[PDB]
Amino acid sequence: SMWIQVRTMDGRQTHTVDSLSRLTKVEELRRKIQELFHVEPGLQRLFYRGKQMEDGHTLFDYEVRLNDTIQLLVRQS
Numbered sequence: 001s002m003w004i005q006v007r008t009m010d011g012r013q014t015h016t017v018d019s020l021s022r023l024t025k026v027e028e029l030r031r032k033i034q035e036l037f038h039v040e041p042g043l044q045r046l047f048y049r050g051k052q053m054e055d056g057h058t059l060f061d062y063e064v065r066l067n068d069t070i071q072l073l074v075r076q077s
Contacts, residue, residue: 004059005069006033009047013037022060026053029070039074047071 003018015036030041
């Protein structure tokens with residue numbers, strides 16, 4: 001069980017996502033992020049240490065650890 005921070009690329013908005021496991025899928029993270037930031041998954045692009053995060057992969061795949069941060073960019077289209 002784990003928690004991570006999601007912060008916008010501009011720095012202005014941040015939310016903890018919790019009740020995750022290291023096996024959580026990126027697509028599932030996108031859905032959690034929608035509830036908190038109100039951004040449809042299709043417009044979310046997620047970055048971990050500058051690397052774009054892809055569906056089908058887990059947090060463990062990206063080596064994300066407890067309370068690490070991932071960036072959210074919101075596309076216009």
